[PDB]
Design an enzyme around this catalytic site. Structure first.
Site, PDB file in Angstrom:
ATOM      1  N   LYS A 172     -49.357  51.407  -4.054  1.00 45.44           N
ATOM      2  CA  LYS A 172     -48.826  50.064  -4.148  1.00 45.44           C
ATOM      3  C   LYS A 172     -47.890  49.826  -3.002  1.00 45.44           C
ATOM      4  CE  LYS A 172     -48.041  46.013  -5.797  1.00 45.44           C
ATOM      5  NZ  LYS A 172     -48.038  45.521  -4.382  1.00 45.44           N
ATOM      6  N   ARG A 214     -48.413  44.614   6.584  1.00 46.14           N
ATOM      7  CA  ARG A 214     -47.575  44.081   7.660  1.00 46.14           C
ATOM      8  C   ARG A 214     -48.368  43.744   8.909  1.00 46.14           C
ATOM      9  NH1 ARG A 214     -41.873  46.680   9.749  1.00 46.14           N
ATOM     10  NH2 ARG A 214     -41.243  45.899   7.678  1.00 46.14           N
ATOM     11  N   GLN A 251     -41.483  53.313  -0.349  1.00 43.43           N
ATOM     12  CA  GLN A 251     -42.156  52.695  -1.488  1.00 43.43           C
ATOM     13  C   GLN A 251     -42.350  53.648  -2.667  1.00 43.43           C
ATOM     14  OE1 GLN A 251     -43.057  49.397  -0.473  1.00 43.43           O
ATOM     15  NE2 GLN A 251     -43.008  49.075  -2.742  1.00 43.43           N
ATOM     16  N   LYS A 266     -48.408  51.577   1.966  1.00 43.75           N
ATOM     17  CA  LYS A 266     -48.210  50.385   2.786  1.00 43.75           C
ATOM     18  C   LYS A 266     -49.262  50.378   3.842  1.00 43.75           C
ATOM     19  CE  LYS A 266     -44.404  47.491   2.949  1.00 43.75           C
ATOM     20  NZ  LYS A 266     -43.225  47.796   2.081  1.00 43.75           N
ATOM     21  N   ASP A 300     -46.086  41.816   3.278  1.00 50.26           N
ATOM     22  CA  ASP A 300     -44.840  42.232   3.875  1.00 50.26           C
ATOM     23  C   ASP A 300     -44.600  41.166   4.979  1.00 50.26           C
ATOM     24  OD1 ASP A 300     -43.074  44.692   3.537  1.00 50.26           O
ATOM     25  OD2 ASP A 300     -43.251  44.628   5.732  1.00 50.26           O
ATOM     26  N   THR A 303     -38.264  39.075  -4.788  1.00 49.69           N
ATOM     27  CA  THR A 303     -37.554  40.033  -3.958  1.00 49.69           C
ATOM     28  C   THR A 303     -36.144  39.593  -3.667  1.00 49.69           C
ATOM     29  OG1 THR A 303     -39.635  40.595  -2.906  1.00 49.69           O
ATOM     30  CG2 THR A 303     -37.594  41.484  -1.932  1.00 49.69           C
ATOM     31  N   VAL A 363     -37.898  37.065   1.837  1.00 51.25           N
ATOM     32  CA  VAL A 363     -36.736  37.749   1.227  1.00 51.25           C
ATOM     33  C   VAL A 363     -35.490  36.932   1.490  1.00 51.25           C
ATOM     34  CG1 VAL A 363     -35.290  39.792   1.070  1.00 51.25           C
ATOM     35  CG2 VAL A 363     -37.737  40.029   1.415  1.00 51.25           C
ATOM     36  N   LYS A 366     -41.249  28.330   9.145  1.00 51.86           N
ATOM     37  CA  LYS A 366     -41.911  29.655   9.145  1.00 51.86           C
ATOM     38  C   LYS A 366     -43.317  29.654   8.587  1.00 51.86           C
ATOM     39  CE  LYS A 366     -38.399  31.181  11.095  1.00 51.86           C
ATOM     40  NZ  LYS A 366     -38.358  31.771  12.444  1.00 51.86           N
ATOM     41  N   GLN A 374     -40.125  28.783  15.469  1.00 53.32           N
ATOM     42  CA  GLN A 374     -38.838  29.438  15.535  1.00 53.32           C
ATOM     43  C   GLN A 374     -37.760  28.504  15.000  1.00 53.32           C
ATOM     44  OE1 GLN A 374     -39.040  32.723  15.891  1.00 53.32           O
ATOM     45  NE2 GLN A 374     -41.203  32.506  16.496  1.00 53.32           N
ATOM     46  N   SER A 387     -44.464  42.221  -8.543  1.00 52.12           N
ATOM     47  CA  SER A 387     -45.771  42.580  -8.047  1.00 52.12           C
ATOM     48  C   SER A 387     -46.421  43.449  -9.111  1.00 52.12           C
ATOM     49  CB  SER A 387     -45.667  43.342  -6.738  1.00 52.12           C
ATOM     50  OG  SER A 387     -46.653  42.945  -5.814  1.00 52.12           O
TER      51      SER A 387
END
Ligand SMILES: NC(=O)C1=CN([C@@H]2O[C@H](COP(=O)(O)OP(=O)(O)OC[C@H]3O[C@@H](n4cnc5c(N)ncnc54)[C@H](OP(=O)(O)O)[C@@H]3O)[C@@H](O)[C@H]2O)C=CC1
Ligand SMILES: NC(=O)C1=CN([C@@H]2O[C@H](COP(=O)(O)OP(=O)(O)OC[C@H]3O[C@@H](n4cnc5c(N)ncnc54)[C@H](OP(=O)(O)O)[C@@H]3O)[C@@H](O)[C@H]2O)C=CC1
Ligand SMILES: NC(=O)C1=CN([C@@H]2O[C@H](COP(=O)(O)OP(=O)(O)OC[C@H]3O[C@@H](n4cnc5c(N)ncnc54)[C@H](OP(=O)(O)O)[C@@H]3O)[C@@H](O)[C@H]2O)C=CC1
Ligand SMILES: NC(=O)C1=CN([C@@H]2O[C@H](COP(=O)(O)OP(=O)(O)OC[C@H]3O[C@@H](n4cnc5c(N)ncnc54)[C@H](OP(=O)(O)O)[C@@H]3O)[C@@H](O)[C@H]2O)C=CC1
Lengths: 459, 459, 459, 460
Positions: free
Chosen positions: D78, D82, D99, D114, D154, D197, D232, D279, D284, D386
């Site tokens: 899990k 990324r 993790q 990951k 991620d 998160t 996050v 985002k 930016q 999750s």
């Protein structure tokens, strides 16, 4: 006559079938003889060689088994046994019982059972580990969380389960509810260690209650137990918790009984000490010489508990099959025993059972000795295993109470099914107790037989 | 002592092991006792219920088996048997023989064998079809062209194979060399029907040649045969083709022998008529009353051929295991029989074999009766099955000659391996014939044992 | 700058890339720059833990690998390396080389390689069996006879392949050409042991015969070999067979050189005695105190043979990567060596390669040093390996002769292809030998680049 | 020994764990676990692969793909995926290593993994992403599953991208299953996952603040310095504002955006939504230099982290990426009177910074000290919910927004409490001094995992 003689299985079959005969079941549902015929041949059996390495580097051979007897009600479900006497005949009897025990949970579980003639005695922890690794290599391909879900039995504790799981995981690249009796961090359920022995007691509470109209309980009863394993350990602990006195425990070597059965008992402490020995695989014989035990207990080598406990009220054979003989059943009746439930699968010899049901038929109400078969009383364990599967399935871990609540429901529902179904299909005489063996066997068999018909296994 | 008694298997094991002992094999390679121990426990066994519908609509139960005994040399390879006496013990003996027979082909084939206690007698073609459909449903998942490749044996002809194949194909969505004894349009090999009985004869040609220094052949020899199935049918046809006289044939009911054994024989015609009956599953008993047969042959109910053929030179038991007793072996010696090779797996009882090898040890050169075990002589069949697999593998169909050429090579190579390996590991006295049983058993066992060591099945 | 520095890989890549660059290829095929970008990133890579147990019962950790680099021309094909130097960089140079080498054999084979940092030195045969078993428990899923077919390289011989195979069979329940270099009786191919070595020599016969217009052969040639393993041994035995004098072998601890390089040579018997020590995982140093070797040879710990032979005509780097330095190449040049072929994969450093090609550009005809890359000369090994797969899939075993024959042919076309491709794409000056490496690269490369394009792997 | 590639980010997190285990009585009581430490730090399995994919101009493109399946004793593999040009084996090893232990702390059955790829989402059209995700999942799915390995998102992998992978997975495997988390509402996702998160971080700190002040303070009144402006960072900030706390900083990979009056002033939820939008567009935060609204109230600081420009501040929530708090920077946060700092980002604080905050906790009694909480304890809310997605997908139902928020809150209370109580048993702090959360979090995660591994025969 081509068929090989399998006496442990034949026994299991003949008791069940006999109880089915001595009942108006086949009058109401004659077609069921065809269901009995079909169900009795197992759906699938896997036999396999297991080659493994001892610490001295030498190569060892043993016999793997997995009886997958009936998957009508659910995935095959049943324990694993490592014991030198393990053959097909034996694992077939357990697999057969397991079919019908599992039905009385009302959870979706088929009957299976497996194991090996591997003997864990004399064996190192490492040797046991290797053996499990080789055993699971072959068993891996026939089992799975939606297919077949093993667990423990004689010789297969949570430790062995650990080694088996780890290797299953390596092989199949899958983390799933493929085994029960698992440890807490990794998909285990709370109450599972305790569930079988707890279940037995919970079931006898109901036998006592009904037999005596709620007058008596385990409160101050003398309770002979045999064996000193996971069943008998937590059977004994629950008897105490309800104010009962556990007067006897045994192992392979002998029975160990309190010198004053009238008034003395085992204690949670003393039991925890006997547990420690059976993780290390030592015998009771080792701790009789210490001060605590020497003064309190007699230890009788080669002797079973039953005939040396004097007066006694409840009997819980929890060692192995065929450990209460008819010699030994009569002795219990004569000692005023009035409740006997099987912790161990097929604990009572036919001859013993024949004395018990004859007695119940001869003596009215509470004057009767009341036998309950293993498939009714040691169902607690498998029933929580189902809860373990469900926990894994839902992907969460339930609390001890949540589970013990469900265990209570399920042991009670199972007494009530045996009782009601005994009254319905084989009504006792006036003032006589229903047959708990017959009603449990019939209730289990019927649910299975009809699910088999619906599915097309027979017509 | 936990182990169930399996006498048909134990026999098979003890002859093999005994021949391994009475040899300098274990002096040169003591480690091989560990290989013998390992190899004797089968790698895998699948037992399974088979439920099927008769023409009257009624539900029927039978016992499926598949012994997968050793896959060291190749994928598991071995026939299927439908016969009422089928149990584990029996299919284990065949599976065990098959291991080592298959080694003597020098093709990569493991030992297996399966079947059922399904009896094809009394059964319609439709009933046989349904049964195969249900039998293959369960067997499907344990077998495959790179895993396990079944074929026929008693009760499983090319027709049964057809039904089994079709259902395998349905289930797995795969067209592959998963079975042998297949019919020509769909992956069959030319020579396969003929290959087993041809093989036996080809092997005895070499026994005769060497025994008599090329003086004698099957030319004008009297040849008692038992059974009237695919082995014995094409055994008999090849004897004739090399100028031999087939004096006897039998079935389950009786033997059928020419009244003049000295000078009379069966004919290709008469054999083709007996073949037709065994497609329809009728007994020889049915055609003894017709004009052609009544005048020419005596038919003896319940009697085997051996003791009623008078003088006779070659004996080819081709019915079933344990069909030549020691009573009956002595009778053959006394009738001047000097060659006996097993068409049928374990055709000779130990007691018979003990008379045959005792005789060979007592009498010099051509004065000796020379026994060849089934694993040496009925290897033709399985060897072509390999060629069938290769044909499927290469995705082409070879010519009859191409195959019979390879069959000749392979039967000869197998006589020469048995002979050479007998001289090497258990050298006979001066003028005495090598043991063909011992050398074939040793040559087979060694190739297997060393391949097992290399692979890590033992150390 | 995210990319980890993998020195071993980026070398194999820069020599390949510069040869393509230093040609006409990109002028007529500029789209192939895109092909290079793609091919040089491995399609799949597998890294894994290999937990295993030593003889003391102690837990041991090692790192497993399988690099599956390109499969356009076939299923991944590659050896397995068990050496303490193993990391991803080393396996990625070998796996990448293997792509283009396999492309030159004409057979259908992808580019793979793997192994582990496990070091067989120190280890008992028990400890290797055990590592092997645990090794393939993870590897098993990622491979198969049509997917990825591994084999031996440094530290994985037929012994280890034995253990591996047998485990994989146990795990996948399937008997197949999953590994090459297997034992005779279980799917092995004759001429494998000898393949790579003989192939190197055969290749160099064509080099000699071209450069000298057929005047010189290997007869009376002085040959310096490095290594004493599989490649080295059989190359040495072949050179000996063809009239040549082998003045050197070596291992990880030191060279072993004939005192008299001009007139003397290694012998079969001396090579067969070293081989026996390598089988037993011992060093050359063990035997320097014998009649057999003391007087005839000169042990040289921590050196390579190149500078210490002087009188030399051929150099066969047969041990490991980068075992010939810039300085060492000049020695060989100075000492009149004319032919050099990598038995080992990427045997020569870029510094050394550069010297050999600068010299080839500098001197006409036989007076030059010709350098052949490994992907060309060592291709006999994998080529026959693909003929072992061919034989496994045909369910049959070819003759010693038949294989050797295919081998010589394959190797002749490899030389020819390299030669012609260099002639077309990088035509040398008048008199100057074509670049065998620039040729061999552009030849293998374009076949894969085309195969990829066709398949949509790039556009 | 010296054959192994030098993997700096993996080795960093290995050391912070190993050292925190050494600084305790763990190896005195259970010395055998040194073996487990050695077994666990080698990944169970890892999958690298090429990813060929097509750009908008029709040109072929290559990128490297990775899945690190580190440990599965406690569950199936899990952890997120990324997409970032920096991605390599080393990095993804730290993430998966972290993790194993983070999951160990949610009390749910999840092993550690990951993955991702060196694909860079910046400058790619939504179409180009879709295609990458297609290629990426085509190789990937072979190795994953509802009971095998469950990726997620991620950095650079949002719900947009999850969707592309899910739809390709479904095609390729002919299965609708709980193989991914952070999914859409309509199709197997959970409520409170977007939020999870960041909320999880601010709930965990809510507890840290409760212990330090015996309930007398909260996020009410506190100034909170937050870095990053993604998933996050956004929802951590929203929950701060909700609890009456003042968010004074945000940042991104180009710069930091701080309120001009850090004492009295804060971000509004509306401004956070306006960035969150930037985002989703992969634009930016810099672009706000040209809106008068923001220019009046904020200060953009190109190339600066926010840590030394917030003035006096109370709580620090690194929520961007690893190693975003230098030694220097952590000192300045002590100087500003920050007393609480939790890693939102995985391995968000440097070793210098961890070493300074721990040395300080041991030098200062009670609420004088600054209190560091590791990533694995604080951001565990992502993988906890999750992990509840999977629990919902397995039961084939959906849960109410507050059924999940409650389950979440309870898990962070357990996680804070686990870290505190374990630290007292194994690394008992001195009298008046706060127990080391980083030590106790690492110990408690490690011992569960290594006990399971012993039980399952991974080591002995
Ligand atoms: N565990 C479970 O969940 C369930 C178990 N059961 C049944 O209960 C019985 C015991 O199970 P369990 O307690 O788990 O097993 P354990 O191994 O935990 O304990 C076995 C006990 O029985 C004794 N014993 C075992 N075999 C023999 C024998 N042949 N003769 C005499 N004594 C023997 C053992 O003695 P020693 O210690 O000397 O070996 C030990 O005291 C079995 O019949 C089993 O099928 C039924 C339902 C559920
Ligand atoms: N077919 C092959 O390729 C091979 C066969 N064998 C062996 O040869 C033998 C015969 O094989 P096959 O010819 O294929 O079988 P078939 O069914 O084709 O023929 C069987 C013959 O044997 C008779 N028979 C079968 N069982 C018995 C019994 N219990 N008692 C007396 N007679 C019996 C049958 O009589 P009835 O007709 O009345 O049933 C029939 O005549 C077997 O032992 C088999 O294992 C060995 C190697 C290869
Ligand atoms: N076997 C095959 O089919 C093929 C092999 N090759 C190549 O040939 C080379 C060797 O292979 P193979 O002959 O099977 O290997 P072996 O393992 O059979 O033997 C290798 C020999 O080289 C020496 N050696 C190994 N590693 C080192 C090192 N790091 N430094 C110095 N010397 C070393 C060894 O010394 P010691 O014995 O003391 O360890 C050993 O004698 C490799 O480059 C391989 O890729 C190429 C194509 C095919
Ligand atoms: N997804 C989750 O639920 C969980 C996330 N985490 C951790 O949270 C952190 C971010 O997660 P998430 O919010 O999903 O990621 P997002 O991609 O949504 O946001 C990441 C933020 O970090 C910035 N950033 C990215 N790379 C760098 C860099 N190299 N240097 C400086 N700033 C950078 C980004 O700026 P820009 O916008 O300019 O790229 C962006 O503002 C990571 O450390 C991750 O491991 C931890 C547990 C769970």
């Amino acid at each position: 006559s081509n068929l090989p003689v399998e006496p442990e299985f034949e026994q299991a079959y003949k008791e069940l079938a006999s109880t089915l005969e001595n009942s108006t079941l086949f009058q109401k549902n004659p077609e069921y003889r065809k269901a009995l015929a079909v169900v009795s041949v197992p759906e699938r059996v896997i036999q396999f060689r297991v080659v493994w390495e001892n610490d001295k580097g030498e190569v060892q051979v043993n016999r793997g088994f997995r009886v997958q007897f009936n998957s009508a009600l659910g995935p095959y479900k049943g324990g694993l046994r490592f014991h030198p006497s393990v053959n097909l005949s034996i694992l077939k009897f357990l697999g057969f019982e397991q079919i019908f025990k599992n039905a009385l949970t009302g959870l979706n579980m088929g009957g299976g059972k497996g194991g090996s003639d591997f003997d864990p005695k004399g064996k190192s922890d490492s040797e046991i580990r290797r053996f499990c690794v080789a055993f699971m290599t072959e068993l891996c391909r026939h089992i799975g969380a939606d297919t077949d879900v093993p667990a423990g039995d004689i010789g297969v504790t949570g430790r062995e389960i650990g080694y088996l799981f780890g290797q299953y995981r390596k092989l199949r690249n899958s983390w799933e509810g493929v085994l029960t009796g698992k440890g807490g961090s990794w998909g285990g359920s709370l109450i599972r260690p305790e569930a079988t022995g707890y279940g037995v007691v919970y079931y006898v509470e109901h036998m006592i209650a009904h037999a005596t109209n709620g007058a008596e309980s385990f409160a101050g009863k003398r309770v002979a137990i045999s064996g000193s394993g996971n069943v008998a350990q937590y059977a004994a602990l629950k008897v105490i918790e309800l104010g009962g006195r556990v007067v006897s425990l045994s192992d392979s070597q002998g029975s160990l009984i309190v010198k004053d059965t009238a008034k003395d008992s085992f204690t949670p402490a003393e039991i925890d000490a006997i547990a420690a020995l059976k993780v290390d695989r030592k015998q009771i014989a080792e701790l009789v010489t210490d001060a605590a035990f020497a003064d309190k207990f007699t230890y009788l080598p080669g002797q079973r508990p039953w005939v040396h406990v004097g007066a006694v009220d409840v009997a819980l054979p929890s060692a192995t099959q065929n450990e209460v003989s008819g010699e030994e059943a009569q002795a219990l009746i004569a000692a005023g025993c009035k409740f006997i439930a099987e912790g161990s699968n097929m604990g009572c010899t036919q001859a013993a059972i024949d004395a018990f049901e004859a007695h119940r038929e001869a003596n009215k109400g509470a004057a009767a000795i009341w036998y309950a078969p293993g498939k009714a009383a040691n169902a607690g364990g498998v029933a929580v295993s189902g809860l373990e599967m469900a926990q894994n399935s839902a992907r969460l871990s339930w609390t001890a109470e949540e589970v013990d609540a469900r265990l209570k429901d399920i042991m009670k529902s199972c007494f009530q099914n045996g009782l009601d179904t005994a009254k319905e299909y084989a009504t006792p005489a006036d003032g006589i107790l229903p047959s708990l063996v017959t009603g449990s066997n019939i209730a289990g068999f019927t649910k299975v037989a009809a699910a088999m018909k619906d599915q097309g296994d027979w017509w």
